[PDB]
Structure 1
Amino acid sequence: MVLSEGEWQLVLHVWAKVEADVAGHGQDIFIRLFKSHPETLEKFDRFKHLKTEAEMKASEDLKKHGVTVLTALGAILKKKGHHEAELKPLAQSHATKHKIPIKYLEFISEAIIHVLHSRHPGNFGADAQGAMNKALELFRKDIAAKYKELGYQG
């Protein structure tokens, strides 16, 4: 699949807003993910002890992790589809070291859309959400293909 320049513009326009507060968006997204799909929390040995949203918000390590994740995702989105090089190491660590099923990538994609919808309604209307979903589907599709080449079905 391929996004048009118009769709990329919608994606990058709302992403520019997210970059005004990467740490904050990172926390909201992971808290949403962990609360909505608690099973994903078990994949993080560093955070699986967190019991409440309050503890999650107060975790300095979780906040730093969120920044690392969103920074990596932002770099991929800014490539506008030409992300082969960026995807290689990400696909290897998540398939081989962390063992993250494609299903879980769908869950975090849902969390990202939910947070952008809540925080940026004016810049995240129907068309913008469709563009973001398409960009994330492309990401998940290419990651899945790499998973297979690497020997991980998940």
Structure 2
Amino acid sequence: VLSEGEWQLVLHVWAKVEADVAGHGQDILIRLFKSHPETLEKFDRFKHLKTEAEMKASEDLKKHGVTVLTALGAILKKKGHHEAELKPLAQSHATKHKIPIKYLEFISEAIIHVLHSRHPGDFGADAQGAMNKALELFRKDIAAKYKELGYQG
């Protein structure tokens, strides 16, 4: 469980992400795809992209980056009370898209990397730790739903 203090650190840097949702989403998905190429292959929408420059030039990739961070922002602002936000996400990612929890760990690492890059003054180690705990909490609750549905990772 995160403390109120931890949630404030998390939401303080997230309100900054929201000044440029699309540029953060681009950076995060490109980081994820470059560092873990198995993740790109899960997207029929994006698997034609072969270079970083092509990824940066894709307007559809930018569009989906906003979809992803908008969903994640709505989750974080619930401060743990996110059961209704996670249900449909867990269901689709386990059963339709087939995304292992490990790949949620990968995108969590890409988020932290990009938040550190763009917001160092509001993403010191205390805020890094808090954001890690919030993304861990996300993964834990999704993982419980995956397990229910018989999917792994």
Per the normalisation by structure 1, the TM-score is: 0.98
1:65 Cα deviation from its structure 2 partner: 0.2
Secondary structure in 2 aligned to 1:49? coil
Percent identical pairs in the alignment equals 99
Q: Structure 1 residue 105: deviation in Å?
A: 0.4
Once residues 141 and 48 of structure 2 are traced to their aligned partners in structure 1, the CA distance between those partners, rounded to angstroms, is: 32
Shift of 1:152: 1.1
Q: Distance in 1 between matches of 2:131 and 2:109?
A: 11
State the Cα deviation string for residues 8-54 of structure 1 (Å, max 9, x = none). Answer: 00000000000000001000000111111111110000100101111
Per-residue deviation at 1:153? 2.2
Give the SS at the match of 2:99: coil
How far, CA to CA, are the matches of 2:135 and 2:45 in structure 1? 26
The 3-state SS of whatever aligns with 1:20 is coil
Q: How many Å separate the matches in 2 of 1:153 and 1:52?
A: 30
Give 1:61 shift. Answer: 0.6
Report the alpha carbon displacement of residue 151 of structure 1 after superposing the two structures with TM: 2.0
Return the alpha-carbon distance in structure 1 between the equivalents of residues 24 and 95 of structure 2.
27
Task: Give the SS at the match of 1:45.
Answer: coil
Gapped regions of structure 1 (runs ≥ 5) = none
- Aligned twin of 1:90: 89
Distance 1:67 1:136 in 2: 18
Deviation sequence 1:95-114 (CA, Å, 0-9, x none):
00000001100000000000
Over the aligned positions, Cα root-mean-square deviation in angstroms equals 0.5
Distance 2:150 2:39 in 1: 22
Match of 1:55 in 2: 54
Query: Can you give the 5+ residue segments of structure 2 that lack an aligned partner in the other structure?
Result: none
Distance 2:106 2:150 in 1: 22
Specify the alignment match of 2:68 in structure 1.
69
**1:38-91 deviation line (CA, Å, top 9, x unaligned):** 111100001001011110011011000000000000000000000000000000
Residue 149 of structure 1 and its aligned partner are, at CA, apart by 1.1
Off by >3 Å, runs of 4+ in structure 1: none
Distance in 2 separating the partners of 1:84 and 1:110: 23
Q: Secondary structure at the match of 1:82?
A: coil
**TM-score normalised per structure 2:** 0.99
